[PDB]
Ligand binder design. Structure first.
Ligand code: BTI
Ligand code: BTI
Lengths: 106, 261, 261
C-alpha cells in the first residue's frame, strides 16, 4: 500500500533504499542539504528537494519538522529513516504517525 | 569503530551460535518486535552477554543478505506496508529452512588517511574505478568519477562486499577488489583494509575485539608514488608550455623507424 | 541465440531435475571427464534428451556460481594444477552438501539493435553507467569510459546477473538494474531485455524455447522522451552554432537581483 517513499538520509543507504523501492514499483523522494548539492544520492531518486535554505552541517538531516514539510508537500506515504540520524528518534517516529506518514521501522 | 564484518561468524561454535540466535528471537519474540532489528551480544567462550539493540537496519546488512538471499531493505518496506512475511510479497522461508550458504565480508572504503590517524580527507574525486565480478557486491556511496566529498559527513566512498563457499576464498576475493579499486584526488583507507584483509590472524577466524591494538604491523610504509600521474604531468607540461631548448612548435611528423632486433 | 538464462529451472519438478542431473553425471564419470563441462538436454514432458556436451565454461556459468556459491572458473584453474575437489584448496562440498540457495538470472547487454534485426551496432561509447547493490552481479565486457566497439567480435558490453530467494524477486531485480544502465553512443538490447523480464509468460516459469517466437509483442518498443540527452544536444548546438536572428554576445543572466516571489 505504499506508492511513494521518502528517505530521511544521504549516501549509500539512501541509494540502497532507492534501489529497493524501485524493485517494488514505488516512487522515491530524496532530500539534501546545501553541501549535499552534488551528492550521488540526490540524483538517484525520482524526486529531490532541498531541506530548507538556511541549514548547515548535519543539522539539515536532523530537522524533524522540515523533513515532514517536504514529506507532506510531495504526497509521501512512507519515510525510511535509514540509519544514523533520526532512525532512532522517537519524536520523528511519533510525528510521522500523527501526519499519516508510515515510519519504516518499529 | 567497526572496521570489518563477517557473516556468519567463524570458529565460534555451532551450538553457541545457536543459543545466541535463540536468545535473539527470545528478546524480540517477548516484546513483539516489528521490522529490522539487530540484537547485540558479547562472546566470551561458550558464554555470551547482552549489550544493546539497534532498532533499524545496519551498515553491514549486506553481509546477511548475501549468506541467506534475503533482501532486508526491500522487506522493511513491505513490513511497513502490512506484509505478512510469509505471504507472497516477502517469501520468507519459515525459520527452520533459513540457511547460510558460505561466508561474506564487508568493508567500507572511506577517505580516512591511515598516514594521518584516519583524518577524513576531502576534495574532488578526479579518478574512480571500482571492481565487479564473482560474488563481489558493490554499494556506491559518495563516490563517482565526478564530484566532491565535504568534511560535514561520514566519509564513505563505497561499501564493498565479497562472497564464497569458504571464508578464505572470500578473503582472497575481497583483497582482489581492494586492489582493483583506483581512486585518485582524495587519499583513502584501502591500503589499511588490504593489510587487515591479508592478516594471518584474520583467516584463522579466531580474532578478538583487541585484534587491532595488538597488531602494530597494520599501519605500514608505502605512500605510493603517482606513477602514471607524474607522467601525464610531464607530458601535459611540455605540451602546453614547450620544452625549455627546442623550437616550441607542434609535435613534428616522424618517419617510422622499423627497429632491428 | 541463448538470450536469457535462469538457474535453476523453475519449470521442472524435483524428481525430473534430479534425474536430469543423474544422467549428466552418468555420462561424465563414464568417460573420465576433467575440469568444467556442460551437458545439454532437450526437455519434453517427463523425458530428457541428450543434445550436446560443451567441454568448457559458458557465458552463463555465473548464474550457477550465484546459487551454489562455488566459483567455477577459479576451480578450473585449481584443478589444472592438480588440486583435489574436496581438499583444502578447492573446498568443494561433497555432492550432497551442494545446493541452490535462491534463484539467479543472466542477461547479456549487447549493442544488438532490436528495431533493426538484432544487428550489432558500432562506435564510441559516449556515456556508460552500470549497476550494483542487492543481488546484482556485473562482469565487465567491452563497455567503459569511451571504448569504440568494433564489428569484428561478438558485441558484449556487460554481463548482468541478479540473485534473490524468489524467482519473481530476481526478475523485478533484473528490471531495476536494466532500467538503471546508461549506455550512450550505441544502440543496445536493454529494452528488448526489459521486455522479456516484464512478461507474465516468463514470470510464470512455464516457458518453452518456443517463447520468443510465439510472443510477438516482445518487440513492442517505445523510445521514451530522454529529456536529458535531448537537452544536451540543444545546448551543444546553440553553443557552437548560435541562434537564428541572434548575435553572438557574452551570455546574459546578468543581474544578481533575483526574482520577487
Ligand atoms: O618548459 C616547461 C615544461 C617542463 C620542462 C621540463 C623538462 S625535463 C627536461 C628538460 N630540462 C629541464 O630543465 N626542463 C625540461
Ligand atoms: O542554426 C542555428 C542553431 C539551431 C538553433 C535551433 C533553434 S530551435 C528554435 C529555433 N527554431 C529554429 O529553426 N532554430 C532555433
Amino acid at each position: 500500500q505504499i506508492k511513494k517513499l521518502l528517505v530521511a538520509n544521504r549516501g549509500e543507504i539512501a541509494i540502497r533504499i532507492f534501489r529497493a523501492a524501485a524493485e517494488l514499483d514505488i516512487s522515491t523522494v530524496a532530500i539534501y542539504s546545501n553541501e549535499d548539492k552534488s551528492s550521488l544520492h540526490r540524483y538517484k531518486a525520482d524526486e529531490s528537494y532541498l531541506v530548507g535554505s538556511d541549514l548547515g552541517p548535519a543539522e539539515s538531516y536532523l530537522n524533524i519538522e522540515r523533513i515532514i514539510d517536504v514529506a507532506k508537500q510531495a504526497n509521501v506515504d512512507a519515510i525510511h529513516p535509514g540509519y544514523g540520524f533520526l532512525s532512532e528518534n522517537e519524536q520523528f517516529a511519533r510525528r510521522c504517525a500523527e501526519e499519516g506518514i508510515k515510519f519504516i521501522g518499529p | 569503530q567497526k572496521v570489518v564484518e563477517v557473516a556468519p561468524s567463524v570458529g565460534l561454535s555451532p551450538t553457541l551460535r545457536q543459543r545466541i540466535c535463540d536468545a535473539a528471537i527470545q528478546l524480540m519474540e517477548n516484546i513483539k518486535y516489528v521490522n529490522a532489528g539487530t540484537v547485540e551480544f558479547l562472546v566470551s567462550g561458550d558464554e555470551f552477554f547482552f549489550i544493546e539493540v539497534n532498532p533499524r537496519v545496519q551498515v553491514e546488512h549486506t553481509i546477511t543478505e548475501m549468506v541467506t538471499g534475503i533482501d532486508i531493505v526491500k522487506t522493511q518496506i513491505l513490513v511497513a506496508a502490512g506484509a505478512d512475511l510469509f505471504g507472497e510479497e516477502i517469501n520468507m522461508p519459515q525459520q527452520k529452512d533459513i540457511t547460510t550458504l558460505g561466508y561474506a565480508i564487508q568493508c567500507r572504503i572511506t577517505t580516512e588517511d591511515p598516514l594521518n590517524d584516519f583524518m577524513p580527507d576531502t576534495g574532488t574525486i578526479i579518478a574512480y574505478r571500482s571492481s565487479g565480478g564473482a560474488g563481489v557486491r558493490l554499494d556506491a556511496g559518495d563516490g563517482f568519477q565526478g564530484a566532491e566529498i565535504s568534511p560535514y559527513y561520514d566519509s564513505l566512498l563505497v561499501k564493498l562486499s565479497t562472497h564464497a563457499i569458504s571464508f578464505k576464498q572470500a578473503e582472497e576475493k575481497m583483497v582482489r577488489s581492494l586492489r582493483e579499486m583506483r581512486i585518485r584526488g582524495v587519499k583513502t583507507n584501502i591500503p589499511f583494509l588490504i593489510n587487515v584483509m591479508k592478516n594471518k590472524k584474520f583467516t584463522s577466524g579466531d580474532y578478538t575485539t583487541k585484534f587491532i591494538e595488538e597488531t602494530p604491523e597494520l599501519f605500514d610504509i608505502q605512500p605510493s608514488l603517482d606513477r602514471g600521474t607524474k607522467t601525464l604531468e610531464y607530458i601535459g607540461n611540455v605540451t602546453i608550455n614547450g620544452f625549455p631548448n627546442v623550437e616550441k612548435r607542434p609535435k613534428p611528423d616522424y618517419e617510422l623507424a622499423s627497429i632491428p632486433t
